[PDB]
Amino acid sequence: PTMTARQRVWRAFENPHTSTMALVFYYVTGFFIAVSVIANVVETVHIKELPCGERYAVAFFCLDTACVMIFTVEYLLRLAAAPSRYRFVRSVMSIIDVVAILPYYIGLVMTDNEDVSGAFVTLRVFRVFRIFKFSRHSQGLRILGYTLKSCASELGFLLFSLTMAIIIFATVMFYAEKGSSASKFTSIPAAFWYTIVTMTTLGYGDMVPKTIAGKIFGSICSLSGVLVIALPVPVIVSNFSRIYHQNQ
């Protein structure tokens, strides 16, 4: 550390298992992320069965912003130790941090002038994206992201073949299960749900074929789901085994 504090605090940020301040910072950031997400889960769950976010959610507000505050300041700390400050901002981790921290300020701006319920649930949904801040803490998430980036073509073919099979089988089932007495196959988009439930070997029973023609193609769909889905599964797993092993 022959120069200013930037590099000697960045080495603590980049390597949290060294020194003692880095470990404390790592633990406190992890604890704050965990407590924030647990608080969100808890607040999601007499005149009525009022949830824990109407009579409460004063402290659940302050607590939340406290966590957010910490995130902001630590992000500022990560802006005070980056030789590649602009490139660091362009990095995926900085993007995840910004996506995690923006909802609170966006909601504050929205509630400063007027208030609408259209972005309320949207912002609350985006608020859970602070789970992904555990990527720094856990190596497994980084390995999973690396594998998903590596086999990008395999996921593309997975999506393309899945959409193709879904369209084909939904069309077949809709045209084979249209004249039933009480049929839920009102359209091909309404048969997309049944096709994706059957292909993944999930099964729900809400939408089932009630015709001989629809049962024959309702069982081939299940077999074709195994064939289509299980082609890119090994390559994702093999990449995970290869990348994780090569890091050792």
Binding-site sequence positions for K(+): 201-204
Residue 40 C-beta: closest distance to its own copies, Å: 7
Regarding 236 and contact with its own copies (CB under 8 A), the answer is yes
Between CA 53 and CA 39 the distance in angstroms is 10
- Give 19's contacts (C-beta < 8 A, 6+ positions apart): 12
Decide if 171 contacts 188 (C-beta within 8 A). yes
| Burial label, 245 (beta-carbon count in 10 A; 0-12, 13-18, 19+) | exposed
Regarding 222 and contact with its own copies (CB under 8 A), the answer is yes
Regarding 37 and contact with its own copies (CB under 8 A), the answer is yes
Regarding 174 and contact with its own copies (CB under 8 A), the answer is yes
- Of 140, 139, 131, 137, the closest CA to residue 33 belongs to 131
Between CA 15 and CA 227 the distance in angstroms is 43
Residue whose CB is less far from its own copies, 66 or 208: 208
Q: Residues forming the annotated binding site?
A: 201-204
Regarding 83 and contact with its own copies (CB under 8 A), the answer is no
Q: How many CA atoms lie within 13 A of 58 on its CB side?
A: 2
How many residues make contact with its own copies (CB under 8 A)? Answer: 63
CB atoms within 10 A of CB 20: 8
Residue 8 C-beta: closest distance to its own copies, Å: 31
- Of the listed pieces 43-51, 64-72, 96-104, 108-116, which binds its own copies according to CB under 8 A? 43-51
Decide if 173 contacts 209 (C-beta within 8 A). yes
Regarding 110 and contact with its own copies (CB under 8 A), the answer is no
CA distance between the termini of the chain: 29
- Of the listed pieces 3-11, 34-42, 85-93, 101-109, which binds its own copies according to CB under 8 A? 34-42
Regarding 233 and contact with its own copies (CB under 8 A), the answer is yes
Write the residues followed by a gap in the chain (C–N more than 2.5 A): 45
Residue whose CB is less far from its own copies, 111 or 187: 187
Residue 218 C-beta: closest distance to its own copies, Å: 8
Contact residues: its own copies, CB under 8 A: 37, 40-41, 44-45, 51, 121, 124-125, 128-129, 131, 134, 138, 140-141, 144, 157, 160-161, 164, 167-168, 170-172, 174-176, 178, 186-190, 193, 196-198, 200-206, 208, 215, 219, 222-223, 226-227, 229-231, 233-237, 240-241
